[PDB]
Symmetry: D3
Subunit: 151 residues, 6 copies
Amino acid sequence: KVNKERTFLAVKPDGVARGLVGEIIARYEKKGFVLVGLKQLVPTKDLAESHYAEHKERPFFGGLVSFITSGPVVAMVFEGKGVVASARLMIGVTNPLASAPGSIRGDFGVDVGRNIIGGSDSVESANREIALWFKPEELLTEVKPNPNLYE
Amino acid sequence: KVNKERTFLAVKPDGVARGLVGEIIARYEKKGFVLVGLKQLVPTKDLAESHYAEHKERPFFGGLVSFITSGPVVAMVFEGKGVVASARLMIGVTNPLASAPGSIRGDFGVDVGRNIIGGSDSVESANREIALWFKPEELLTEVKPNPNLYE
Amino acid sequence: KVNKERTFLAVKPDGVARGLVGEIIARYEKKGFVLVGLKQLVPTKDLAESHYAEHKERPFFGGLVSFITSGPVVAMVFEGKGVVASARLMIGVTNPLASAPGSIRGDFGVDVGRNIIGGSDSVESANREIALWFKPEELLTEVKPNPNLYE
Amino acid sequence: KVNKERTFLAVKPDGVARGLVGEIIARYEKKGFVLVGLKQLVPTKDLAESHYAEHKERPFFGGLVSFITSGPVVAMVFEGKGVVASARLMIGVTNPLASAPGSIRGDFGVDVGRNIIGGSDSVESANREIALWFKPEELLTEVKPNPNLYE
Amino acid sequence: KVNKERTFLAVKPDGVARGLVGEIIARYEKKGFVLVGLKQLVPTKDLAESHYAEHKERPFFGGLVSFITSGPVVAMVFEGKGVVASARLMIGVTNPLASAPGSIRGDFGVDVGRNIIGGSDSVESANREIALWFKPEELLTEVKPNPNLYE
Amino acid sequence: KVNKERTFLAVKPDGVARGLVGEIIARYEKKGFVLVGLKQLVPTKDLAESHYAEHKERPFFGGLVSFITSGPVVAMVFEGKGVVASARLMIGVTNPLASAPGSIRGDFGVDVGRNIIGGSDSVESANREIALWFKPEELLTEVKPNPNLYE
Ligand SMILES: C[C@H](Cn1cnc2c(N)ncnc21)OC[P@](=O)(S)OP(=O)(O)OP(=O)(O)O
Ligand SMILES: C[C@H](Cn1cnc2c(N)ncnc21)OC[P@](=O)(S)OP(=O)(O)OP(=O)(O)O
Ligand SMILES: C[C@H](Cn1cnc2c(N)ncnc21)OC[P@](=O)(S)OP(=O)(O)OP(=O)(O)O
Ligand SMILES: C[C@H](Cn1cnc2c(N)ncnc21)OC[P@](=O)(S)OP(=O)(O)OP(=O)(O)O
Ligand SMILES: C[C@H](Cn1cnc2c(N)ncnc21)OC[P@](=O)(S)OP(=O)(O)OP(=O)(O)O
Ligand SMILES: C[C@H](Cn1cnc2c(N)ncnc21)OC[P@](=O)(S)OP(=O)(O)OP(=O)(O)O
């Protein structure tokens, strides 16, 4: 279906430390997106390096890897129609200072390096990120569509 | 006045079923718009066709008419300066996935067919919609202006 | 059955004027109680005296009648298991200053005469109050059983 | 330490289905309790029976084991001073209708069978429940004491 | 009248450092209590000792003085009927773990030493505390009574 | 250096009277901006004219001066990276009706004359406004950077 689209979201160590996990989950739940995977973990260097592989050649890659592996991360997978692009709109933009009020980064962030949450940029990136962070057993298979949310 | 402008708003069956009525009323109350009419009802095919008349030649007309009659609707009328255009901005856009975080559809909707709330598109549409859903007795006549909201 | 119990609730002129209608409705909706009746109206002296009949010989009767008729009131009917005793608990006690934080009066009221909301004191009072404020046509007959709320 | 006390909390299938996971996590985070374990899973009949082992001879045991395995559950472990007793106070009482406004069950529940969340009744039950639902690797070891929350 | 009663409230350094100032102020404003004095300051040892004078011979006195001077404090004065006792009820009890959900300490605190906010225990203590923290010029004199909050 | 930027914000008499002080302070605190100055006062014509000096020859100058002196104002100073531009984004635009939902004016305002809060338009205007409303003693000097908010 088109309503079975999935995105990977990570509440970064700064979002976890600031106690924003519930606030964030509650925003995606109110939207109508279904939580199909959820876990708290301290990421390994390998998970971090494979996750941010598009920034591997840039000077700040080291710091990104160090910071995401510096403390607990809440990894989640949400399912819904256009969940990839929608989840991103809900987060805001790279710079939290330029992110609109009402968005996660707009409401809670001030620094690019401490930008609370990260989401998949595309359906291809999502499917790769989901497989990396989660095992098939850790993901829901039975997802009954809400007739209140979908026509 | 100007500040006596009125708009018609309908919390659709999906918005009532999902328990979003108070959430929605609170947003317009916080804004400074005065509730001049309020009721819960199951709309008739008669009322629905008349309400959705601007789309009577479109292929989706029947579907809009079927859905708005499928369960209880919370019908309301708000009064304030630029309430028609403002109420619409507060709702978001046709596609809830494209609606900005901070708006009703932006925060709670995923599908065009399940887009929670509908509002008048113009002052002319509002005056027609208000007369169609409400009787003069069901509307407030005495509206004292709040000196904290109006200069 | 027992989950089909109904209570009458009135957001008094002070609760309406202060813009607390959406806040209050959202509280009962969150709880799992179903809205089966809703309307805004300016009560007549006849409706006000009939409503406050149990206190018709008390010195404060006139004052209660004068205030409930002084502006718009939001009249509602909620359905659920033990809704009568549960709505009262959610409201708090007669004196809002003695009402616990978390209740409507505890969170928003300071005066007995400006105590925002009133609810039915018993199933008997509820059935009488509902018939007095609402016509059978104004009340839902089809109430969808929620399997997440009720075992 | 005393501040290193841990409790096991489960958002039951009804709490997950109603989209209350984030609302719940936010409440414990706002309090100052640290999340040390988190996961979503559909529990097996075995894990449910071992979890509800204290009631294995009671007539309602079967019903509790059937319901907790009927859909996804969000399993969590929180750390803090008096977290076992405090989480329970935050949840409310067995009957959500008797639970005080401000508590989780007092704000969102109407039925004993659909009472959203369950928490450990003691430190001994917590240590057993934590070991039963989580592997030592799934739980945090490094827990930074907040000098704003602890003297 | 008796609606002119005043209380002194202090958001302690832990309260301020955790970013609970606006949350706390919103609660008293929603209640109907009028803010008649407000300031942020780092208290001097002299002001701290004078404030905590009733406990000057207790073993914990030193610790209370050390902590209230360790960082910024948001000092405020609220006016309204029974504001002294009501403000205390809103705060909760000495131990935040024993404080009811819905109270400031019940919702946000875990430790007696980090109990976010302090309020006057009596009208006599309030009048003394107000004079100690505020100059007559720093306090409002013109307080128009809200007819929506007082009969 | 860059994270030490400061802005001046004034919750205008309309914002104070509508009890919005707590809501506003919370928004800036959630964001990660540090409150370095805070006070409630009734501004003098001298302070008002100096504050609104950039518009001293515009026809609306008198109206702005009259209104900001008509009741209590909550003056505050926030510190953070890009706080001047970010605080304006959080306020919205001049016309609250055109302000996006999620912004303060977008969420609570209807009139240009009653637009709840004013903020510095530039770093130069901020430094001037801060020195005008606050004495150096009234401002924090020791501001430890939060490692959860800054890289
Ligand atoms: C490129 C970004 C931001 N970033 C971190 N440090 C720096 C830095 N020093 N210079 C520039 N950019 C930086 O890193 C990943 P993230 O924060 S998950 O995501 P996003 O939502 O921004 O998005 P996408 O476009 O990666 O999906
Ligand atoms: C024409 C629209 C949208 N729409 C619903 N289904 C479809 C569909 N199948 N194809 C196209 N458009 C669709 O219907 C009305 P509504 O949802 S109250 O919203 P609006 O706020 O956009 O309204 P207005 O702009 O007319 O006020
Ligand atoms: C007798 C009560 C209390 N009361 C109101 N004004 C006064 C007054 N001036 N002197 C004394 N008592 C007063 O009046 C009804 P109400 O306010 S709808 O509701 P309740 O929910 O508290 O209760 P119940 O009456 O339905 O049990
Ligand atoms: C025995 C308890 C209570 N209870 C639930 N259904 C029934 C029922 N049908 N008959 C009797 N008792 C019942 O079951 C677990 P729970 O629902 S998580 O609740 P709790 O958090 O209140 O309790 P505890 O186990 O920590 O005390
Ligand atoms: C003596 C009391 C209690 N107390 C604080 N720390 C300690 C401590 N370490 N050991 C014992 N007792 C302590 O101190 C004041 P506070 O904390 S504002 O609270 P309150 O609500 O009790 O009120 P009041 O005293 O203003 O009435
Ligand atoms: C010039 C503005 C707006 N303004 C008020 N009345 C009028 C009026 N009658 N005609 C035009 N403009 C008016 O005055 C300041 P303020 O209201 S704090 O707004 P802002 O914070 O959006 O401001 P800035 O600092 O960016 O200007």
